[PDB]
Design a protein around this ligand. Structure first.
Ligand SMILES: CCCOc1ccc(C[C@H](CC)C(=O)O)cc1CNC(=O)c1ccc([C@]23C[C@H]4C[C@H](C[C@H](C4)C2)C3)cc1
Ligand SMILES: CCCOc1ccc(C[C@H](CC)C(=O)O)cc1CNC(=O)c1ccc([C@]23C[C@H]4C[C@H](C[C@H](C4)C2)C3)cc1
Lengths: 264, 264
């Protein structure tokens, strides 16, 4: 229909407006020039140029793995803010009760975060720092436990997600569908949320049919990736709690503490 | 030994990484929510939601039994690709000659496919479409010949296979052992393949000893299931050839035609 094509276009435009990075942009950068972080020397060089304040403390600088963990948190706080603006484009979201908006975003943001991380990842590493660096998967594996274990499951997911060959017009609807999940704990007006979700999923189904006529299973494949993301986030939150208990230098931003609070 | 436990763990991890469905995941879904296909009404409903493109042709849509047969083929092409990636974890496989890799996979994929189908089957039906549907065994029996005869022998095998109560750590090694069969026709370097097979079977034997101390016959039982699978695949290929000759609408994907070509 014309109102459903317009809805898919609205969501896509709200996605291009609100996220500083998208798959088209990331792929152009990755083709090639981003500075390569592949070892401890190049990490320290990239820090001095790209996050100078974080390493301006001399011997009082944190352990490298803790600095990296802090940078990862900074990007999540940014993406949570972008995701919050993006959600207003979803028909009905801005009409929901404020508390329900908080709940849907609370459980959705990290699913959306790791879904969109796939856009900047390849089998060798990931684009980072607003397109200005490329950090290798092998370097992230070289970080001492438990910090290396944060990274590799995200690459594992992203490689399978990227094999679906989604574009930005697909991913925007997928992120909307993530936010609209009506089975989140503590929702007040579940019935209105289910109707909101039905609408986005309806548009997503039709969009994948027209945009990917070569893969007749892409919609159920993406439904399964939503479940995989929910499990990926549950496991992530557990590793973060381990880091919180065992690593006194790895302070969690208060905004992210609130997201994790009473999640898993 | 430590290198043999590590090998069993490597194979298991490569299995969890490369197959989108496993027994743990399937059982959780089957406990309960997948949409139930139990009659012609619910088949057509599931098609419109889950493979919309396949039924978007109006009166030019294929007969229901042919649509189902087409979906089954699509999943085999997917599993053949996953199986090909999985095989690289088997010590020595990636070192074999390219032609031998093709031959081992040619004869192994359908044995592995029907072995792993058991994980998503119970006595009443099977999980389908990336965990999003459940199609009943009785509905598949209701399909006109010859299409109903594709389905029931797979349930018969799976019920006996599932009574062995294997878990994913067992099945991963079993699928590796299937791929390593050194008596496939046309192998070039049979001696190297026999040593590769000996290694996987050695690890499988020791793994079943520790993981199933209650069933002292489980290893010979699984050897017999490998022979049963070879016969199941031979009979499957014969029914597929009948369908190829007698059903002009049931086109075989070219990749699967090549697998069947000069098999039985
Ligand atoms: C394998 C996936 C790694 O990325 C991850 C992983 C987990 C998370 C979630 C975080 C974990 C603390 C969260 O729970 O909020 C976020 C990112 C996203 N990380 C980033 O966007 C990121 C951004 C900048 C950097 C830097 C690190 C160094 C080197 C280089 C310049 C500068 C200093 C920033 C890249 C690193 C990661
Ligand atoms: C009793 C066993 C039935 O399953 C079989 C049987 C044989 C084979 C081998 C195939 C036969 C053509 C081959 O030779 O490659 C594969 C499967 C695996 N089939 C599937 O994975 C499958 C996937 C999706 C569906 C659908 C069919 C309808 C209903 C529902 C949604 C949508 C449309 C997909 C499930 C059905 C079967």
């Amino acid at each position: 229909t014309a109102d459903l094509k317009s809805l898919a276009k609205r969501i896509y435009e709200a996605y291009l407006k609100n996220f500083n990075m998208n798959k088209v942009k990331a792929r152009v950068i990755l083709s090639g020039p981003p500075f390569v972080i592949h070892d401890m020397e190049t990490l320290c060089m990239a820090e001095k140029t790209l996050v100078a304040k974080l390493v301006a403390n001399g011997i009082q600088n944190k352990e490298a793995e803790v600095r990296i963990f802090h940078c990862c948190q900074c990007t999540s706080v940014e993406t949570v803010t972008e995701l919050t603006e993006f959600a207003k484009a979803i028909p009905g979201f801005a009409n929901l009760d404020l508390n329900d908006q908080v709940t849907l975003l609370k459980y959705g943001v990290y699913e959306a975060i790791f879904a969109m991380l796939s856009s900047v990842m390849n089998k060798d590493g990931m684009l980072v720092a607003y397109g200005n660096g490329f950090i290798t998967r092998e370097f992230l594996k070289s970080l001492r436990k438990p910090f290396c274990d944060i990274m590799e499951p995200k690459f594992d997911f992203a490689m399978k997600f990227n094999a679906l060959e989604l574009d930005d017009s697909d991913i925007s609807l997928f992120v909307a569908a993530i936010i609209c999940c009506g089975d989140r704990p503590g929702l007040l007006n579940v019935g209105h949320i289910e109707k909101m979700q039905e609408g986005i999923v309806h548009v997503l189904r039709l969009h994948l049919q027209s945009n990917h006529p070569d893969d007749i299973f892409l919609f159920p494949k993406l439904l399964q990736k939503m479940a995989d993301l929910r499990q990926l986030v549950t496991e992530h939150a557990q590793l973060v709690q381990i880091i919180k208990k065992t690593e006194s230098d790895a302070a969690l931003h208060p905004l992210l503490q609130e997201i994790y609070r009473d999640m898993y």
